[PDB]
Amino acid sequence: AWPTHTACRNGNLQVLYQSCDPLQDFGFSVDQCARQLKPNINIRFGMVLREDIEQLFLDVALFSKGLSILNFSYPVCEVDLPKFSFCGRRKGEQIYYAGPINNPGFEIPEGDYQVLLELYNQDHATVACANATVLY
Amino acid sequence: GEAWPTHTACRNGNLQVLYQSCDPLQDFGFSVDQCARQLKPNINIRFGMVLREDIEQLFLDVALFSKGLSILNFSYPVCEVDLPKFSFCGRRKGEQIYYAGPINNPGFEIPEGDYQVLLELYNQDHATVACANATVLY
Amino acid sequence: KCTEKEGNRTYNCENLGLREIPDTLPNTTEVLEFSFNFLPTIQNTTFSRLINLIFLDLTRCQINWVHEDTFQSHHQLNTIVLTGNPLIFMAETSLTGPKFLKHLFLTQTGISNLEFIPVHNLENLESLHLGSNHISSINLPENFPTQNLKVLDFQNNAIHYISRKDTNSLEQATNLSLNFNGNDIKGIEPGAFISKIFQSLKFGGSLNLFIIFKGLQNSTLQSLWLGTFEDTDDQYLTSATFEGLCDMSVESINLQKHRFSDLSSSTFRCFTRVQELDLTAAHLNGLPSGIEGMNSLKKLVLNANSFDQLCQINAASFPSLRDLYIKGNMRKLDLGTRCLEKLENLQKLDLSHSDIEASDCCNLQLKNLRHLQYLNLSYNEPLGLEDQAFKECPQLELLDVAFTHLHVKAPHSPFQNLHLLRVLNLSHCLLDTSNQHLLAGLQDLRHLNLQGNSFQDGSISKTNLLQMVGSLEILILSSCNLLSIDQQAFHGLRNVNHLDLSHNSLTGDSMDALSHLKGLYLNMASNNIRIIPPHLLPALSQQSIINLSHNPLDCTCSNIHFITWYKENLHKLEDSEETTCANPPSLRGVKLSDVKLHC
Amino acid sequence: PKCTEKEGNRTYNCENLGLREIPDTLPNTTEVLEFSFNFLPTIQNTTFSRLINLIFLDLTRCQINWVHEDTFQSHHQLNTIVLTGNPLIFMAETSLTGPKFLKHLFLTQTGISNLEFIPVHNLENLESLHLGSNHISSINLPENFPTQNLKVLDFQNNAIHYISRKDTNSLEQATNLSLNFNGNDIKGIEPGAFISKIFQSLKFGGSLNLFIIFKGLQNSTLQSLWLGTFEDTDDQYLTSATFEGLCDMSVESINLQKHRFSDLSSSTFRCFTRVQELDLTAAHLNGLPSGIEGMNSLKKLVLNANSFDQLCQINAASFPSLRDLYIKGNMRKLDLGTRCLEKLENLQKLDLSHSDIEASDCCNLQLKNLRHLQYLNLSYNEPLGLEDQAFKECPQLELLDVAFTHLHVKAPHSPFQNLHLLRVLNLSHCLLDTSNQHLLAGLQDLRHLNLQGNSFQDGSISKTNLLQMVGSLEILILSSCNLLSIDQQAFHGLRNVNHLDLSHNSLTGDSMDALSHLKGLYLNMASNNIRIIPPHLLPALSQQSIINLSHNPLDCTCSNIHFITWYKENLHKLEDSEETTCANPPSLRGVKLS
Ligand SMILES: *[C@@H]1O[C@H](CO)[C@@H](O[C@@H]2O[C@H](CO)[C@@H](O[C@@H]3O[C@H](CO[C@H]4O[C@H](CO[C@H]5O[C@H](CO)[C@@H](O)[C@H](O)[C@@H]5O[C@H]5O[C@H](CO)[C@@H](O)[C@H](O)[C@@H]5O)[C@@H](O)[C@H](O[C@H]5O[C@H](CO)[C@@H](O)[C@H](O)[C@@H]5O)[C@@H]4O)[C@@H](O)[C@H](O[C@H]4O[C@H](CO)[C@@H](O)[C@H](O)[C@@H]4O)[C@@H]3O)[C@H](O)[C@H]2NC(C)=O)[C@H](O)[C@H]1NC(C)=O
Ligand SMILES: *[C@@H]1O[C@H](CO)[C@@H](O[C@@H]2O[C@H](CO)[C@@H](O[C@@H]3O[C@H](CO[C@H]4O[C@H](CO[C@H]5O[C@H](CO)[C@@H](O)[C@H](O)[C@@H]5O[C@H]5O[C@H](CO)[C@@H](O)[C@H](O)[C@@H]5O)[C@@H](O)[C@H](O[C@H]5O[C@H](CO)[C@@H](O)[C@H](O)[C@@H]5O)[C@@H]4O)[C@@H](O)[C@H](O[C@H]4O[C@H](CO)[C@@H](O)[C@H](O)[C@@H]4O)[C@@H]3O)[C@H](O)[C@H]2NC(C)=O)[C@H](O)[C@H]1NC(C)=O
Ligand SMILES: *[C@@H]1O[C@H](CO)[C@@H](O[C@@H]2O[C@H](CO)[C@@H](O[C@@H]3O[C@H](CO)[C@@H](O)[C@H](O)[C@@H]3O)[C@H](O)[C@H]2NC(C)=O)[C@H](O)[C@H]1NC(C)=O
Ligand SMILES: *[C@@H]1O[C@H](CO)[C@@H](O[C@@H]2O[C@H](CO)[C@@H](O[C@@H]3O[C@H](CO)[C@@H](O)[C@H](O)[C@@H]3O)[C@H](O)[C@H]2NC(C)=O)[C@H](O)[C@H]1NC(C)=O
């Protein structure tokens, strides 16, 4: 299986992830690691696309002690609204993004959690998959 | 295993120039734009390769044959530490190059018949940068 | 192994790490998806076996060399995709061969000099894709064919200036569209686009629109995309910004995601000849009143903004408007009353996902919209529809309120007046299906979606609301937790041909209700069908396509008649691969196709 | 399969071997690893852990995609990391932390378009950062990017079109910083961007508008400015107008190679008044204008590769303070004239090589008045006719080089006679006539002579010869002269030598007699016809420091037994041992004499 990378490490806080796309790994990092996540945080991302992303969606499922908690879906790129400069890139293009995502602020209650993140396009093709662990 | 494939540098009429790479490590892409008996001065070429040696210093050796007899040998520097003649001089080992521009040749009415030319680019430590076993056919 | 995506004509070989074309692949192959394989060198020999290719995708195959005559034997090649290859050199005749090569993708191939592209056989090109390269001048080489060029994509490159000299290169083209998205354009020589040959231009993410407009002086464009992105650096549009616009003509402008510094009616001084305006996610809390410079607008898009009352758009400004989109509003949108009253010619209105919630809907809230054909109120907070709630919409043709809870007092008929209405989507509206007069008025409706609502006792009776929409062709009743459908439930439905009962809990006897129908698409996937009694087996055989997938189907002798039927009619059966036995344990998981029983 | 031990247990070369991992062969003690052209898609903490003492690591063109966290944690002495030519997808934040003093990082042609890609964590000790041939368009560094010790910053062949004051302010923490912009098409520079005194040297090679550049560099102090162009670069034309911006700045050294001067007047150099070095190489010059006044304080002028007809056309009057003058590679018959450099009283270096010079009564009038000249280079020229006392008028000369320029000297003339301070003389392939005993008369104090490629009567150096007239020599090169023998008492009278090169002749073991009176030299006898080394003169070899007997048909019978035990005993003292092998007998032909 793919290696477990460290998205970040401030103090006792740290966020680990590993790619659950069997075809490839990818590179991800967050810039400030804090309990109090500011809004409009900055990320870094490095990957080669295996699908066109004119339409691109994010699914997030959050887990605690193997049972589940919150599920949502948000669109990143839509035909009538590319939110990001990288929208509408083609399958086969390499990407490096270093910039903001538009997250509202939120805390994270203390506790060890596993988050499962999935980026996919309109045909439900996998663009990227992270099995992530947040450690308090 | 197999030797490198013979590419066509050009083909105008009955004239044509073929070449094959004699660097065992790799091929390279070359083409001349106008193919004529009368070679104009300052002709334009096209070239594609990955460098395996630094070319701050770079020299060209040309040996020409015909009826398998030796009719001329010369050496000309392409890049020198005190004179980089081309924009690509001083590139590092490992850099990919694409050059599409002039070289500073002079005239040359190509005489009738057939010609075997051996071209060798090398640096100051005699390391191979590029090697062509070329055939000229009229 | 590759995948036969279509009989002998299309195959997928992606991510297989192949170093050569398989002997498996037949002469008759026309579409080959060959991404993520390993072809360092490409030659005359590489694709010779496959002489009839129409579409060839070599994305990300590590190609370094494309040697001479590679495609000589490939007369019908239409599209070549080379995206993501570290190309070192392409021979002069490397793409000659095809008689009508219309699309070449050279995206992210490392190109910084356009002289690198072999021109020999490009005169039939309709689209050339050069995005994410290392390019800094759109100036094409001399003697580069551009006559049939209709799309030319230059995204994410290093183009900082466009000159008259540069654009003149493209003079042979006709109706050409260019994409410059993600190039930081610092200047354009004025008049570079005077040529009438330019249909559409995109300058996405550009940090100085004044510069752009000034450059496009005296030009005619179908559309101009000047939208920005989240990640793009912060600017602020002004009335000043658009001064250059009234020395040019564009039918369609997009200004997505921008911030208007001091929005006045004066800001739109030069929008007088614009026909479509898109202000999506422009941080608007309203529009100014009395514009006068959107007098000839036909299409306005105000999606993803922050309005509080609908009237704040000041509709007075755009009398000639045909289509209005206010989808995805970011806070409770109060529709008000008589707010769109002035928009007498409106035909499309999308209010979906805009956190709207209305009380006595919708005659007042849709006052005077005599000619509306499409209304979308889906994904909203609850709506109370009165009797005849669209009486002020007699020409409505498609109504969509999916995922918007409807509150209707039995026995009101909310859609009575809508006699020209053919498509109605009430999915997940939590409709009270008791009200036999819910769907009154809709004798001539053609397409009804009642997905994810619910019927008393989990059953559709002899008597029921569908007896008011008799002329239907498409009926969707999926996810309604139906346990049963009465034998006569759908007598009265004269013209059905698409029936979706999937994701309920129906059993085989429920197929009785279908006996009087012929040649439908019948979807019964994900139900609780086990044994299909033989007497009502001809009900299945009377149809065109059947889906019985994801059912706990029975594979004992008690279901023998159904199993021989299924094998006999395999061709008529959709989603066959996922139609498998539950009983007995030995055959659990076995596809029905493969069941071998003896009785 | 196998790497090469380039130096004992410390340097190895593993290039082009397609390795997917570090070999177990490679030892703990490795400090320099050249690992180009291998296959390391991913790089990790485990990749280089066996090799804990690396100082220099070259991973060029290894198809690296990923450089994962803590890769170099255990590599405290890493000085240089070379990543050129790898398709990098992502580098972890701590991927280069570990080394205590990482001084050089090469990220050339690695696909970088956003400088945020480079992990800053452990870069504060960087002395050089190489970012050429990437997809970069702004030299603006990220905030909190260390620049204090940055001394070289290479931005070649990128897509940089504008440089702003904001951009350059990023680099304010640097001191004596040098930047290379060669091959970027610079369309504008915000004026004053380089007012900061921290900038030592800038290169703007191939740039198509020098007016724009100079205007940008207004009010700046630079050591040097490289504004040369190339063959392939598009055609411009320099004017007096072009350089107007130059006299609102200060630069010691300017290069304008390969340019074309539209209307060269003395007015063209109005703003060169504080320039100390000017290089006009291959500038299509047929001369220089007279009476410049604006190269009054020049010390170094380079006019190489031009097209002069007469030397006087350079109008030397213009540059009295000149020290070094280079006119190498002239493209047509250069006539030296007479008294032409007479005004250049302080000249110290003069290079006239490869300029197709055919002097004939040389060189007192050609070199009139050049009293302080120390270095003269007339190599690779057509024949010179050297006067008796050829160089009276250049007396304080120190190094004279005429290699490959046929000297015509009518015996018994002494052309070098006045050159009392000459310490290095190169007459290689000059086609001398060594028969003249007086050819080197007056060179009693010379310390280094090169007579390579000349001939001798009978191919033999007798008791009496021209070398007992240069009695002091330390370095003597007599290679590739076709010598069959040297007389026993031929080098007596030279009692100083410490470097003797007799290689590439047909000398034999009995020629070693001539060395008996000497001690501790570097003795190169490679490529001769030595077979048996007689034992009585074996101590002549043992008296020396380094010996090279390689490429000799050395004898490996019992008749050479004494020499074979000597050679094994003294292996350490023997240079090029690997290529020193037997000729006889057939059984041992090719065997290393070890
Ligand atoms: C009237 O207007 C409505 C409302 O806009 C239109 O609704 C559209 O309907 C079409 C057709 O049914 C849908 O198309 C299909 O889309 C999927 C991908 O769907 C993904 O998005 C879903 C919706 O996301 C928004 O809404 C959800 C629900 O509230 C919300 O939670 C999300 O966060 C998101 O939020 C919005 O925020 C703003 C609010 O102001 C919006 O405006 C903004 O735009 C944001 O949308 C989402 O639910 C879904 O996730 C679910 O499903 C996935 C699927 O696996 C699952 O993973 C999750 O767990 C969830 O269960 C997705 O993320 C697409 O894949 C389909 O593609 C199929 O068909 C196409 C062609 O049709 C083929 O190319 C393919 O082969 C494939 O088979 C399909 O395109 C669309 O989703 C929907 N749009 C919106 C915005 O809701 C309606 O069409 C209009 N009517 C008419 C007549 O035009
Ligand atoms: C005084 O000035 C003279 C004259 O310029 C200086 O001469 C220099 O001397 C140094 C030291 O000996 C030489 O350095 C070594 O160079 C080799 C590479 O040599 C290559 O170039 C050779 C010369 O080329 C020009 O001249 C020849 C001969 O006429 C001509 O045919 C060529 O065409 C070329 O022409 C010139 O055109 C113009 C004429 O107007 C010139 O101005 C212009 O500059 C052009 O030069 C060339 O002969 C040689 O080819 C021969 O040898 C190769 C070797 O295999 C063989 O393949 C061929 O078949 C030929 O037989 C080469 O192309 C370099 O490899 C050496 O590197 C070693 O040493 C260095 C450090 O010293 C180490 O890094 C390495 O480990 C390595 O071991 C070495 O640097 C130099 O060649 C020469 N320069 C010139 C221009 O001649 C002299 O140095 C000055 N004196 C003092 C005291 O400073
Ligand atoms: C409620 O059901 C209706 C009826 O099926 C759904 O309408 C469908 O909406 C989709 C997409 O919104 C339309 O598809 C589009 O077709 C056009 C034209 O060919 C094409 O350009 C687009 O790419 C897209 O595929 C579809 O035409 C339309 N169906 C009908 C019959 O009009 C509607 O989506 C449902 N609502 C929700 C919220 O799901
Ligand atoms: C004739 O013989 C002389 C004597 O050796 C040769 O002189 C040598 O010239 C070379 C190169 O031109 C000098 O090498 C240089 O050294 C400097 C300083 O360390 C370094 O910066 C350069 O990279 C280069 O290696 C060398 O110093 C010089 N030797 C001496 C003793 O001065 C000369 O080149 C010979 N002529 C010909 C045509 O071969």
Side-chain angles (χ1 to χ4, degrees), chain D residues 148-165 167-171:
Chain D
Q148 194 146 15
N149 310 342
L150 212 49
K151 312 270 153 181
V152 176
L153 213 186
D154 192 313
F155 281 107
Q156 290 161 90
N157 298 128
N158 275 285
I160 298 162
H161 297 278
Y162 192 61
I163 305 182
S164 76
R165 282 235 294 265
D167 291 345
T168 60
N169 186 239
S170 155
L171 323 170

Coordinates of all heavy atoms in Angstrom, one line a residue, chain D residues 148-171, unseen atoms left out:
Chain D
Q148 N 20.2 35.4 3.1 CA 21.3 36.1 3.7 C 22.6 35.6 3.1 O 23.4 36.4 2.6 CB 21.3 35.9 5.2 CG 22.3 36.8 6.0 CD 21.8 37.3 7.4 OE1 20.9 36.7 8.0 NE2 22.4 38.3 8.0
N149 N 22.9 34.3 3.1 CA 24.1 33.8 2.5 C 24.1 33.5 1.0 O 25.1 33.0 0.5 CB 24.5 32.5 3.2 CG 24.5 32.6 4.7 OD1 24.5 33.7 5.2 ND2 24.4 31.5 5.4
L150 N 23.0 33.8 0.4 CA 22.9 33.5 -1.0 C 23.9 34.4 -1.8 O 23.8 35.6 -1.7 CB 21.4 33.8 -1.5 CG 20.9 32.9 -2.6 CD1 21.2 31.5 -2.4 CD2 19.4 33.2 -2.8
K151 N 24.8 33.7 -2.5 CA 25.8 34.5 -3.3 C 25.6 34.3 -4.8 O 26.0 35.2 -5.6 CB 27.2 34.1 -2.9 CG 27.5 34.1 -1.4 CD 27.9 35.4 -0.8 CE 27.6 35.6 0.6 NZ 28.1 36.9 1.1
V152 N 25.0 33.2 -5.3 CA 24.7 32.9 -6.7 C 23.3 32.5 -6.9 O 22.8 31.6 -6.2 CB 25.6 31.8 -7.3 CG1 25.2 31.5 -8.7 CG2 27.0 32.2 -7.2
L153 N 22.5 33.1 -7.8 CA 21.1 32.8 -8.0 C 20.8 32.7 -9.4 O 20.7 33.7 -10.1 CB 20.2 33.8 -7.3 CG 18.8 33.4 -6.7 CD1 18.0 34.5 -6.2 CD2 18.0 32.5 -7.7
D154 N 20.7 31.5 -10.0 CA 20.6 31.3 -11.4 C 19.2 31.1 -12.0 O 18.6 30.1 -11.7 CB 21.5 30.1 -11.8 CG 21.8 30.0 -13.3 OD1 20.8 30.1 -14.1 OD2 22.9 29.7 -13.6
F155 N 18.8 32.1 -12.8 CA 17.4 32.1 -13.4 C 17.3 31.9 -14.9 O 16.3 32.2 -15.5 CB 16.7 33.4 -13.0 CG 16.2 33.5 -11.6 CD1 16.8 34.3 -10.7 CD2 15.0 32.8 -11.3 CE1 16.3 34.3 -9.4 CE2 14.5 32.9 -10.0 CZ 15.2 33.7 -9.1
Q156 N 18.4 31.3 -15.5 CA 18.5 31.2 -17.0 C 17.3 30.5 -17.6 O 16.7 29.6 -17.1 CB 19.6 30.4 -17.3 CG 20.9 31.0 -17.1 CD 22.0 29.9 -17.1 OE1 22.5 29.6 -18.1 NE2 22.2 29.3 -15.9
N157 N 17.1 30.8 -18.9 CA 16.1 30.2 -19.7 C 14.8 29.9 -19.0 O 14.4 28.7 -18.8 CB 16.7 28.9 -20.2 CG 17.9 29.1 -21.1 OD1 19.0 28.6 -21.0 ND2 17.8 30.0 -22.1
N158 N 14.2 30.9 -18.5 CA 12.9 30.9 -17.9 C 12.0 31.8 -18.6 O 12.3 32.1 -19.8 CB 13.1 31.2 -16.4 CG 13.5 30.0 -15.5 OD1 12.7 29.1 -15.3 ND2 14.7 30.0 -15.1
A159 N 10.9 32.2 -18.0 CA 9.9 33.1 -18.7 C 9.8 34.4 -18.0 O 8.6 34.9 -17.7 CB 8.6 32.4 -18.8
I160 N 10.9 35.0 -17.6 CA 10.9 36.3 -16.8 C 10.9 37.5 -17.8 O 11.8 37.6 -18.6 CB 12.1 36.4 -15.9 CG1 12.1 35.3 -14.9 CG2 12.1 37.8 -15.2 CD1 13.5 35.1 -14.2
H161 N 9.8 38.2 -17.8 CA 9.6 39.3 -18.8 C 9.7 40.7 -18.1 O 10.1 41.6 -18.7 CB 8.4 39.1 -19.6 CG 8.4 37.9 -20.5 ND1 9.0 37.8 -21.7 CD2 7.9 36.7 -20.2 CE1 8.9 36.6 -22.2 NE2 8.2 35.9 -21.3
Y162 N 9.3 40.8 -16.8 CA 9.4 42.0 -16.1 C 10.1 41.8 -14.7 O 9.9 40.8 -14.1 CB 8.0 42.6 -15.9 CG 8.0 44.0 -15.5 CD1 8.6 45.0 -16.2 CD2 7.4 44.4 -14.2 CE1 8.6 46.4 -15.8 CE2 7.4 45.7 -13.8 CZ 8.0 46.7 -14.6 OH 8.1 48.0 -14.2
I163 N 10.9 42.8 -14.4 CA 11.5 42.8 -13.0 C 11.1 44.1 -12.3 O 11.3 45.2 -12.9 CB 13.0 42.7 -13.0 CG1 13.4 41.5 -13.8 CG2 13.5 42.7 -11.6 CD1 14.9 41.3 -13.8
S164 N 10.4 44.0 -11.2 CA 9.9 45.2 -10.5 C 10.8 45.5 -9.2 O 11.5 44.6 -8.8 CB 8.5 45.0 -10.0 OG 8.4 44.1 -8.9
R165 N 10.6 46.7 -8.7 CA 11.3 47.0 -7.4 C 10.8 46.1 -6.3 O 11.6 45.6 -5.5 CB 11.0 48.5 -7.0 CG 11.9 49.5 -7.8 CD 12.8 50.4 -6.9 NE 12.0 51.4 -6.1 CZ 11.7 52.7 -6.4 NH1 12.1 53.2 -7.6 NH2 10.9 53.4 -5.6
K166 N 9.5 45.8 -6.3 CA 8.9 44.8 -5.4 C 9.7 43.5 -5.5 O 10.1 42.9 -4.5 CB 7.4 44.6 -5.6
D167 N 9.8 43.0 -6.7 CA 10.5 41.7 -7.0 C 11.9 41.7 -6.3 O 12.2 40.8 -5.6 CB 10.7 41.5 -8.5 CG 9.3 41.2 -9.2 OD1 8.3 40.9 -8.5 OD2 9.3 41.3 -10.4
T168 N 12.7 42.7 -6.7 CA 14.1 42.7 -6.2 C 14.3 42.9 -4.7 O 15.3 42.5 -4.1 CB 15.0 43.8 -6.9 OG1 14.4 45.0 -6.7 CG2 15.0 43.5 -8.4
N169 N 13.3 43.6 -4.1 CA 13.4 43.9 -2.7 C 13.4 42.6 -1.8 O 13.9 42.6 -0.8 CB 12.2 44.8 -2.3 CG 12.2 45.2 -0.9 OD1 11.3 44.9 -0.1 ND2 13.3 45.9 -0.5
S170 N 12.7 41.6 -2.4 CA 12.8 40.2 -1.9 C 14.2 39.8 -1.5 O 14.4 39.1 -0.5 CB 12.2 39.3 -2.9 OG 12.7 38.0 -2.8
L171 N 15.2 40.2 -2.2 CA 16.6 39.7 -2.1 C 17.5 40.6 -1.2 O 18.7 40.5 -1.2 CB 17.3 39.6 -3.5 CG 16.3 39.1 -4.6 CD1 17.0 39.3 -6.0 CD2 15.9 37.7 -4.3

